[PDB]
Every structure is written in C-alpha cells, then in structure tokens.
Amino acid sequence: DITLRVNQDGSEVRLGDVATVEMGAEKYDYLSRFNGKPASGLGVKLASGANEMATAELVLNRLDELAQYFPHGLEYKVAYETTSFVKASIEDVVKTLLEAIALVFLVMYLFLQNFRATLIPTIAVPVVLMGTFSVLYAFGYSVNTLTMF
Amino acid sequence: AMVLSAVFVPMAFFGGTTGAIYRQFSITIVAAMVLSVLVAMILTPALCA
Amino acid sequence: STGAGSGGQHAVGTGVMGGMISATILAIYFVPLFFVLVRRRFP
Amino acid sequence: VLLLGGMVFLFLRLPTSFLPLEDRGMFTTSVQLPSGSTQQQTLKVVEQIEKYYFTHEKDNIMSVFATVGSGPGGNGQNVARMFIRLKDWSERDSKTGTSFAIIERATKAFNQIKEARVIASSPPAISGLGSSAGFDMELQDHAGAGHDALMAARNQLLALAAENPELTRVRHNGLDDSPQLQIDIDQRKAQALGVAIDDINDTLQTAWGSSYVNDFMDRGRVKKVYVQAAAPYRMLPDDINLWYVRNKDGGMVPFSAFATSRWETGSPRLERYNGYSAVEIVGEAAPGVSTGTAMDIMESLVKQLPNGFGLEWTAMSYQERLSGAQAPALYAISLLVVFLCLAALYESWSVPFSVMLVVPLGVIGALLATWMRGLENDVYFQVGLLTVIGLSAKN
Amino acid sequence: ALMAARNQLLALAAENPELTRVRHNGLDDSPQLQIDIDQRKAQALGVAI
Amino acid sequence: IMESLVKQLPNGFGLEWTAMSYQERLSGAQAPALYAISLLVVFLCLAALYESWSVPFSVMLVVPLGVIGALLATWMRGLENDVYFQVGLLTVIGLSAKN
Amino acid sequence: DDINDTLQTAWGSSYVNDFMDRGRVKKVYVQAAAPYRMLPDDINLWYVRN
Amino acid sequence: MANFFIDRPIFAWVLAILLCLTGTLAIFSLPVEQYPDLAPPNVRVTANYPGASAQTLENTVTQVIEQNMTGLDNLMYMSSQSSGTGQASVTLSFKAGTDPDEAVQQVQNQLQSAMRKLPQAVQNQGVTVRKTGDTNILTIAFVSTDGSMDKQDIADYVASNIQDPLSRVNGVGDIDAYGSQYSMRIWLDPAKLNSFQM
Amino acid sequence: PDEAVQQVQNQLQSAMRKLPQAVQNQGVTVRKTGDTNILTIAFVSTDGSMDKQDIADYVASNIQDPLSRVNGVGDIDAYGSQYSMRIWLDPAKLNSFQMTAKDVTDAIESQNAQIAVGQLGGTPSVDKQALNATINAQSLLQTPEQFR
Amino acid sequence: GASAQTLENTVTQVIEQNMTGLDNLMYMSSQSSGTGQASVTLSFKAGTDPDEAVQQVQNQLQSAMRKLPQAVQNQGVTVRKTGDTNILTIAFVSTDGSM
C-alpha cells in the first residue's frame, strides 16, 4: 500500500502495482539441509575460561526448555558434538591415574611386602597431584588433553 | 630435581603453536617434579618414621 | 586403548613402554660399566 | 656404539607429525563444483553424496548436515560443506567402522564422481597445525604487472612444481578465472538521449544487485528491507534490455539504446598477501625430502619466474622459517646444565660423564617401539622420550 | 502487570511500620502524543512526506 | 521484611538484591565459611607449632568463651552483625586463643 | 551554495573520487590551473550560473 | 631438611593437609577443556557489499582497509581476499603471545579511520572485526518434521526465539547462525515500472 | 601506551560525527608516536630517469605502506605524495561553454565510479539456470586520456 | 524516534544478549528511555580493572553491532566507565545579580 504517486484523476500507483512484495530471507545463498530435509543450523561457540562440557550441557538443557514451546513439526537435532570426546578423554585419564596408583600399591606389596610401607607411597602421590593442580591453577592453566597427558 | 628440570624446562621456550604445546607439558611436569621432590624431603620421611 | 582419543594414548603408551623397557634393561648393566671406566681413567 | 648408530638410524626412519589423528566421532565432506555453476547443481551433487552416505555407510553414520552455498575455498553457489556425524565408538566396529576406514572408503567412492571435486577429510585437532609435508606459499606480484600476468606466472610455477619430483601435490587454494559479463554504457549516447548516468547506475545496482533500503519491524524485531528485480528478469544477458530509464522530459528510454554487453574473464576471488596481489600456492614436500629443502626448491622456482614476482611463506612454513633449529641449541644448553649440576653433585669432572652416557640407552627402545608399531614422531612421543630419559638418568 | 505489582508492593511497604522512605526509583508511566500522517492525503495534496 | 512482602504479590514476580544489598547478602552467605576456614587455619598452625593434636584442640575450645562475650556486648549496646562485627569476631577468636 | 562550491573547488582542491593507477586506488583532485589562482583579482575571472 | 621433619611428623602432616586442601580448591576452580588456546592470535575483518564483484570489492573496500591497517603491534603478516559473492575478508595474523583483546582492539581502532572511506552500502551492511580462533562446541540443526515450517520459516523462528535465550548462557561466547532471518523482499517488474513511467 | 590509546580512541569516537564531513572523509588517526624521527630515509634517482614526483609516487605506493606495518613503527610520514589525476580547470573555457566547476565535479563523480551490478543468476534464481556469472559495470578510469 | 518498548525490544535486549557472560560480571542493569536513548550498566566484580572491563565490553560489543538496527549503528554506541562518586558540586551564583 506504499503510495508511489497519486494521479490528478484520483487514481493511485502503489508499490504492489509495480512489484511483488513477500517476506523472504535476507540472504538466499545458504541452503542448509539435514538428513535430506531442509533445516537451519545454530553453531554455539565457547567463551574462554569456562568448561566446554558444562557449557554444552547447559545449552542443551536450555534448548530442551525452549523445545516445550516449539511449533508442531519443529525439532532440534545435534549434528555436531564435542562433549562425548572430551568426557571420554577425561574418564580415560582419571582411570589411568587411579589404575597407576593401584598398580603402585600392587608392586609395592609385591616387593616390600609391608602393608604400611605400601601405604606410604599411596598417600604421597595424591598430595603431589594436589600441589600440581594448585600450581596449574595459579599459573592460569586448565585441564586440557595436553595437561592431563 | 635439577637435572630433571634441565631435561624438561628447555622445551618450554620453543616458539609458535608447537612451542605452546611443549610449554604445557613442560610446566606441568616441572611443577609435578618440584612438588614431588619437596614432598620426598618433607612428607615421606615423616611417614616412614 | 581402543576408543575415543586412542591416537595420543597409543602414542604415549608405546613410547613410554619401549623407552622404559629399554632403559631398565640396558642401564642396569651399562651404568656400572661407564662408572668403572671413568673411575679407572680418573680424567 | 652400535646401539647409538641404530638409534640414529631409527630416528631418521621416523616420520614427523605434530598431533595424532583420533576418531573424534565426526568427519567433514566438502564439495566444489566447477566455476560458473548454480546452487541447484550443487544441491543435486550434495543429494548424491548424502544418498551415498545414507546407503553404504549406514551402520556408522548418525546424521549428515550439509550446507549448500558455503565451504572451503570461499563461499559461492558451487561450494558446499557437509558435517557427517558418526555413532558412538562402541556401536560401530573398531576394525571396519573406524572414522579413518570410513573416510578411506569414501575417498575411493568420491573420486569416481566426475561432476565435482568432492573430498572427505577428518577435522584436525587444532586448525593452526598442518601436515609436516605440506607448506604454504604466497606468490606475490611486486611489480604490479596485473592479474593476468600473475595468473600466467602461477600457471608456469605450478607446471615447474609438477615437474620437480621433490614437490608433491602442488596446487593453488584460489579459484580459477571464470567468464564474466561486461556492460558497456555508452556515456555519450546516453547523454544524447537525455538519460543521466547516475540513474542508469542506480537502476543497475538496485535492480540486478540488492539494495538494503531501510528497516522494518516484524513481530517486535527489526528486519532488513531489500529491493531487487524478480528472479526471471535478472537471469540472462538479454534481461538488461527489459529495463527502462527515465530521461529529463519524463519519457522512458530503453536500456538497449545506450548499453551493450560482452563476455570477458575475471577471477571470482581476488587475493592479496601483505598488500600485494598474490595467489596461495600450497604444496607438500615429497617423502624423504626435508621441508626446508622443498621450500628452497620452491624459492628457486620462483626465481626462475619473470622478475617482479616474489614469494612469502605463511602459517606453518613461515613459523618453520622463523624457528630455525632452536631445539638443538636449547638441548645443548640443557646438556651443559645437566653436566654442571652432576659435576657439582659428584665433586668431580669425570663422574658426570657416566650419567650423561645413559641417555641413548632409554631412547633406542622408545624409537624401536614407535617404529615397529608404525607410529610417528609426534609431540606426545617427544614428551614420552623426555620422561624415559629423565627416569633413566635418575636411575 | 509489573506496574500493578509495584504499586501493591509499595502500598504494603507503606503499611509496614518497620520500613521508611520506600520508593520506586524509576519514573511512572506518562501520557504520550501520536501524530498520524495520512500519506495518501499528503500525496493527493502534493506535499512530500 | 521486603522479601516477606514480595511473596504476597501475584505469582510470577521475583526479587533480586543489587548494590549494597547484594554485597550484604554476599557477606551474610560467606560469614560461616570465613569462620570455619579461619578456625581450621588456626588449629593447623597450632598443631604444627606444638607438634600435637591435643594442644590445639584444648586451645580451640576457648574460642566460644570469647565469642559469647562479643555477641553479648554487641546485643546489649544495640549494634548489628555488620562487616565490622565479622572482622571483630576474628579478633576475639585470636585474643581468646592467645590467652 | 553554488558560489561557495565554485570557490572551494577552483581555489581549494576538491577530492572528487578515486581512480586506478597500476593496481592502486589513487585520488582524483579538481582545482583551478595555477595561473588563474595567483593574484587576488583572479576571483573576477570565475563565473557562476544563476 | 629431612631430619627436621623426621622429628616433627605433625608439621609434615599439616603441610600435606594444606597442600591437599589447596589442590581440592584448585580442582573445583580450574577450567576443563579439550585443548587450550594454542594459536597465534588471528583477527579477521569482514565486509559485505551486496551484489558487488571481486574487482569492485577489492578496489573499493579491500585496498582501503589495507592502507589503513598500519601501526599494529606484533603483526606477522596480512592476508586478504575479495570474492565475487560480495564478501571481503582481511586477516591479520599476530605473533604468538600477543593479547587477543589488545589485537582486536587495535584492529578495530584502525578500522574506524577508514569506515567513512568505504562505500555507503558496505557501511550499512556493517564491518565486523572478530577473532578467527572460534571453536564451535555444538552445531544444532532445526528441522520441521511435519513439514509445515519451510526453511525460511525455520531460520526466522530460530533467529527470533532461540538465538536470544541460548546466547545468555554463561559459557556461551558466540552463536553463529547458518540461516537467514525473514526480511521484507520487493521484487521489481521492469514491464510494470515502464508501464507506470516509474 | 596501549591504555592511553584506548582511552583517547574511546573519547574521540564521540566527536567524529561532529567534525566537518571533509575531515571525516580524510579520516582522523590516533597514533602512539612522538615527533622525532628515529630514521629519515631519502630516495634519490641516480640515473635521473625518475622525476622527483615519480620518486615520491613510487615511494608512497610501494614502500610507505610495507614500512608502516613494520613492528614498532608508530607512524611514518612521507615528504612526498603519490600520483593523482590532477585536473586544472580554466575559468575562461568554463565560461565559454557556460559550465560551472560543479558541472565538472558532478560529471567526474558520475562517470568514474565502481558500480555493483550483480550476477547472472543470483539467489533466488529461476528454476533450471544455466550458470551464475558476475556482471561488471563501468570501472575506475586509469589513463589521463580517459579523463580527457 | 523509537518508542520505549520498541527501543527495549530492539536495542537494549540485543546489547544484553552478547554482553551476558562477561568475565567477573555481577549483574546487568538496562534503562530504555522514551526519548530514544538506551542505557545498559554492567557492574563487574569488585577489584576488576575498569580499563580491562571497558576493553572487554567494547570487544564483545562488536559481535552485536550487526544485530542492532541501522539507525542505531549510525548513531554509534558509546562504552564509557561510569560511576556516581560526586566529589564536589560547585554552585556558581552572582552576588550583584548582574549575571
């Protein structure tokens, strides 16, 4: 109904008379598709200084909360995730650490064969681990794949 | 402790992304070594006694 | 280790295993030899 | 002595890498149709690729998220990027369903598609890190000879690199030149007819190209307003003549009266490095050839090119150029410090030599193990080697 | 609804003898004037918007 | 009282303290932690100094004897549990441990 | 506005637009010729359009 | 020093307790991630000229930005590309150890000088200076199972109702969208315009 | 120095619009530099082939920009300016043809510009489109003869 | 020209979006006015460097400039550290009344 001009006869020339007006997309270049069906993506990027696992969990929980108000038909699908890999890495590292402590206990009782002497290193390694974690936090480091290795 | 530090410290001073990758390991291992040596001379003798 | 991150875990495990085996086998013999030689010469 | 020699041999035989590749749970497939291709053909190729993924590698794939209109080498209607997500490591077999096996099969399958260069790859752990064999060079144009001269020099340099056996898989990361349409607006004729050149330019810009005229509010949010020609009226070179421009008197002047169109060639993407017109010529050093040797060969080849065309290394190649054999110097200083500390500890100048000679004892086993298992000289191996050195030294 | 809740809370606070000088820091709603311009009549008369 | 009043409003309206109110709520929340950590540090230091777990335990039993007097004096004078009282209870803990 | 325009373009230089010179976007300037902007009476040489 | 603590086990126990407590606090405090920030700080300047050509974009945007990116600190090299799509990217790779915030601040400050020199359309589209070290945690795809919502409808709904609440999560730094929100589109018809002398 | 530059730039951004439009087009620069030149380089043509103006143009085109990005160089002022398409008006000729200087300026602005026409088949495109090729309008003039 | 509700929906909320989650951010306060001016106040944690906070806000502001309307971008967004510490309030008065 935008009036381009009004003729002297009372006739009007509107924007719809010389063009077709529709509500489309600003950029038609992208044609994102998911599993053969048209879809739109939403990539979330971590802010430095926060846990990526916890951030991903919170994002998924919030999107699940938002999923209650989705119009019929619309569903959110995760097409790319890094939480599983980093969780598996942390689990493997902590498993190796605990298994190494257990094997230290086993070998100590195999050679020295004293339960208390066996306890002596079993209690000395964890305090060094705590000190190392404290130093890493002081230096501004964080639990990475490299630091855990 | 000193020779182990000399083993691990120099990799920290490498330049670039590989330098930072090496620096992570260097700092972690050096901190752990220093803490263990301090614990070895303080906590462990008390436990053994 | 088979699964996620198996690459770096395999790398560190293989390297450490080979190095530690070779060291604990060879040094326990060679280090006395080196010490005896250097103390014999007194350089 | 024989053990030391074997250590040297095994170190020479060990390939060098920066970070091992792990089954991260997903990989990425990229599609690049030949230049001057619409997004419908790209969509057809993407449909073919996703049909292949859903058909053959069905037991391992979980979801493929394609994206037509963008991807490697710059966004365009002939470039598509696909994210393929795989099931949990346990569900897929660890022998024939590993990510590496999947991409190995796919690359064989994808190389049979003549329509477009579709290549599957596994994302790197860090984008900055690159393969040790590969290198990045920026063939610049210091003399300002022009784009055509730069492209001719790039073609000649690529031919020379392909000739050399010390350089493998050398190619440009840019886009090859494509046909373009050149509109010739006869200024004298347009002004004789009474049309204004500014009106002609505005009509062309807001008719064929878009025009972010203003903003409007939709459901409490501001959205852009664009004015552009309808799709059927901006398709062919003959669609130009359909437009009419108004002269001073108010009459409409056809666009064919003062305009003519001809076909020429132009680069879809123009690249500059350090302010100079440049083309990124990426190549990989041949196996058994030092990366520095490959860079020197490339520099000699650039010297063989006509004058005015320099070269500059970028990213990993530039970093390697800056960090020249720092590790040997750092570890020589470390060895000297170790010797001094051991001499102080033992109160002798000869006893510390006994400890220092045990360093090669522990490294040969690690080298032999990492060679037999087929691994490479990655940073993790460096750290493990240092740790075994330290433990042997302590003993 | 927020304004009504604010007014109710302020009335309750005024009732209570253990609170004094409880106030809303912001500004309450005020009348506004809207000028409606008929672009059609403006064009018909010949005056540019 | 303000929090009690805000619960009489129609459901769906909440409240949040800002500026000095937020700082005061932070103080109130962190008080018990400060006392616990300070008591633990004092106990550990005394155990390290006298090489016993009984001397610090016997000493630490006197902290209530001073804290009760500080609380009684503050209550009688009419003062409140402000940041000053907190840095004051810490001083009273120290003085009682000193005796 | 016209007399000001013809006075800050003739006497003072005028950054009209840019042009391409061997691969660089150099500026274009419009100004009076040197002999016609030397004496104080050179203003009388200029003409404006009513 | 060992003989000092042999006679004083309680002192060693106290030191061990302090170390363990500090380590526990650190563990609760320190972040966890896959890899740390291991890359030279790279800053990208993106400008959009709708409907432009590669030559036009390089002439009017890319070179103008390059000529004003001077005085930067620890700048290893500058790489730029002008595409026929209408997007011009200038990448400024800084030396390792440079503060990313300082680098992006300097790049933004240098860009402000050349903002007016850019064409009006480029200014209206907006020129953003952002780091290239973005690490995407998730790539969530929204698909209409019923098929009632078209791709444009899905993209608009996401940009309207989903991009806002998710961007307020504490760990979120940025949320890239792979869809274009609804925009009022006007499709001119040359025959109609010529008919009405417009 | 970085803090001072940040503060000044934050303060300056308020008044950039208040300045005259010509000043904005020229552009305001904030540099953390002094006034003394650490080194002053003189470029001289030994053969005499390059005129003083040619030397200045070459320096400002190929040397000033690369040196300005050298780390540590806060600013590098040039004692010579690059080439420019100088147009010397003649008032007598302008009056002869009844044209003002504004006519010349408008003609140059209109006939020397980079137009963004678009593409042959941009998105959204009609079904079954053969190709998507860029369209080039009139480009910036290069030789002085074109300006004549 | 924006109404208070329109300004809040299209400017203040957008500015809040990206700047949410900054380092050491206690809370955000936004003030959208009917005259068309929108204000967003970020109260960082005590002891944070004000200059670092301003730089962080400016860096994060560039990530939402596009989402802002064109008119808002043209007007420009100002990031200034702001307090309320009125050290002095000098009143200038003329005794004679001539001024």
Residue numbers in the entry:
A (entry chain A): 248 to 396
B (entry chain A): 446 to 494
C (entry chain A): 989 to 1031
D (entry chain A): 545 to 939
E (entry chain B): 693 to 741
F (entry chain B): 841 to 939
G (entry chain C): 742 to 791
H (entry chain A): 1 to 198
Reproduce, without paraphrasing, sentences from the article in which this PDB structure was first reported.
The Escherichia coli acriflavine resistance protein D (AcrD) is an efflux pump that belongs to the resistance-nodulation-cell division (RND) superfamily. Within the HAE-RND class of membrane proteins, AcrD is distinct in that it is a specific aminoglycoside efflux pump that mediates resistance to a variety of aminoglycoside drugs, including amikacin, gentamicin, neomycin, kanamycin, and tobramycin. The AcrD efflux pump is a substrate/proton antiporter. It works in conjunction with the AcrA periplasmic membrane fusion protein and the TolC outer membrane channel to eliminate aminoglycosides and minimize the toxicity of these drugs.
We then reconstituted the purified AcrD pump into lipidic nanodiscs and collected single-particle images using cryo-EM. Surprisingly, the cryo-EM images depict that these single particles consist of a mixture of AcrD trimers, dimers, and monomers. Three-dimensional reconstitutions of these particles allowed us to obtain cryo-EM maps of trimeric, dimeric, and monomeric AcrD at nominal resolutions of 3.09 Å, 2.95 Å, and 7.66 Å, respectively. The cryo-EM structure of trimeric AcrD revealed that this multidrug efflux pump adopts the overall fold of hydrophobe-amphiphile efflux (HAE)-RND-type proteins. Our cryo-EM structure of trimeric AcrD depicts that this pump forms an asymmetric trimer, featuring a conformational state of one periplasmic cleft open and two clefts closed. A detailed inspection of the structure indicates that the three protomers present three different conformations, which can be classified as “binding,” “extrusion,” and “resting” states, based on detailed structural features of these protomers. Therefore, the apo-AcrD trimer presents a very distinct conformation compared with other structures of asymmetric RND pumps found in E. coli AcrB, P. aeruginosa MexB, N. gonorrhoeae MtrD, A. buamannii AdeB, and A. baumannii AdeJ, where the structures of these multidrug efflux pumps showed that the three protomers present “access,” “binding,” and “extrusion” conformational states with two periplasmic clefts open and one cleft closed. Our cryo-EM maps unambiguously depict the change in conformation of residue side chains, including D407, D408, K938, N939, and T975, which form the proton-relay network within the transmembrane helices. Thus, the unique conformation of our structures of trimeric AcrD in relation to structures of other RND pumps may also indicate that the conformational state of individual AcrD protomers may not be correlated with each other within the trimer.
